[PDB]
Design a protein around this ligand. Structure first.
Ligand SMILES: *[C@@H]1O[C@H](CO)[C@@H](O[C@@H]2O[C@H](CO)[C@@H](O)[C@H](O)[C@H]2NC(C)=O)[C@H](O)[C@H]1NC(C)=O
Ligand SMILES: *[C@@H]1O[C@H](CO)[C@@H](O[C@@H]2O[C@H](CO)[C@@H](O)[C@H](O)[C@H]2NC(C)=O)[C@H](O)[C@H]1NC(C)=O
Lengths: 237, 242
């Protein structure tokens, strides 16, 4: 059970998911119809429990995603890469939604989970690491599937918060670069904001090499691109 | 005969557990959302635990303490409505005015209109018969639930409370009603209570604020140091448009 190279499952995973579901559905974003959180938790567990944790497929999450698809109103989506804290504060203030503001994203944010064949329990010792063990693991596949659907459903103007205090604000291998940007629909307009740390000069900008790669992706998607830069965390918020 | 059909009251509502579950989700997510979260699985499990497999004529208030702790029947100050013998009117009034009766609390909403009881040695509801308060036992799980919920609802009342009473009855205040026996005597001291005695359209009222039964209520409220204002000679439509 301790054979993997990543940290083990969040031990109270089931309780945490269900509690977050209650908070989300009742307190944060109550919906047009009720959703049963026990059933959502049950579907989450069933996706991965008692399975080879290195044989995860997108299909395994079909039932779960169908119970709570990560869709948001047009013009209200926020994407981010390497700017977790900033992007979520920005989204909170402007009443916008990141992936972590969707039901399933809110449930899963910051958690780890995996199973073991022949066992009905979470593996709390270790779980597959995406580098050292396998990319076809249940944590990575969940976030890719969720990211795909989140990106696919974007409409009108979307925003991405990128880190202007890094050498490369755009990382082609990030989930944003690999899964989200390539799945935006034509006629979406994407605005990128390259935001730097207060009191520090930016390390990347809209005229840099990494942004060229992003524009290349978006041009092929027929996604309009407007890139802003040279602003600090304070100016952005 | 000593089997499942031995009681004089109607049996448990079929599929009680499904109904509870569905009502709890509806209530917490669509009726009164924005509020602090409640765990509906836990609430259902606590409700069942309170009575299942127990002597159906030995219910006590304490059997429901864990359920009430999960969702106390507390209403915001100034929004609470009591009623007696005016079920339809009181709930229409509460709906139109965005106020809350006992049946508008989480637990009151789950249980309204339902029946339930268990059977010793069984994990299931008795869907065949349940104890009747008058013919079998007062200390049954259905009656005791409404009694303890009523007490907690009255004890937590704050600021101005309103009661809707029936001006078309000879005695609008019945000391042996749940309102008269359990709710009024347990009102938080120093709240203020307004009573409205409402009569049916086109029928002259049968009771008023000056009658003997309202005097009995006044005496109870004086005991609780609760200020009392009573208004009468109103039809349903006059009351709703006040
Ligand atoms: C750009 O990314 C860097 C590197 O992750 C962020 O700096 C870290 O921020 C965390 C959380 O605030 C700190 O605990 C770390 O100590 C920081 N590490 C380093 C190397 O500085 C930075 O906040 C990001 N900037 C923006 C604007 O999002
Ligand atoms: C006062 O109480 C009477 C008696 O319960 C109510 O009249 C009953 O109303 C129910 C539901 O509307 C009917 O099914 C019964 O047939 C009625 N019975 C009688 C004797 O009329 C009346 O609605 C109450 N009035 C107010 C203002 O609440």
């Amino acid at each position: 059970l301790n054979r993997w190279h990543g940290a083990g499952s969040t031990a109270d995973f089931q309780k945490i998911i269900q509690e977050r579901c209650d908070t989300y559905t009742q307190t944060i974003r109550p919906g047009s119809r009720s959703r049963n959180c026990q059933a959502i938790r049950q579907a989450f567990m069933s996706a991965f429990i008692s399975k080879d944790p290195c044989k995860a497929t997108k299909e395994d999450y079909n039932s779960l995603i169908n119970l709570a698809p990560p869709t948001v109103p047009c013009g209200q989506q926020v994407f981010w890469s390497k700017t977790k804290e900033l992007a979520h504060e920005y989204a909170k203030r402007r009443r916008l939604m990141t992936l972590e503001d969707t039901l399933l994203g809110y449930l899963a944010d910051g958690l780890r989970w995996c199973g073991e064949p022949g066992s009905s329990d979470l593996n709390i010792w270790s779980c597959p690491d995406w580098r050292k063990d396998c990319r076809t693991n249940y944590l990575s596949v969940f976030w890719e599937v969720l990211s795909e659907r989140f990106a696919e459903s974007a409409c009108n103007t979307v925003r991405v918060v990128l880190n202007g205090s890094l050498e490369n604000a755009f990382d082609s291998m990030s989930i944003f670069g690999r899964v989200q940007a390539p799945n935006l629909r034509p006629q979406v307009e994407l605005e990128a904001w390259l935001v730097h740390d207060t009191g520090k000069p930016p390390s990347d900008s809209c005229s840099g090499s990494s942004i060229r790669k992003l524009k290349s992706i978006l041009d092929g998607r027929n996604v309009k691109f407007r890139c802003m830069d040279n602003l600090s965390r304070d100016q952005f918020l």
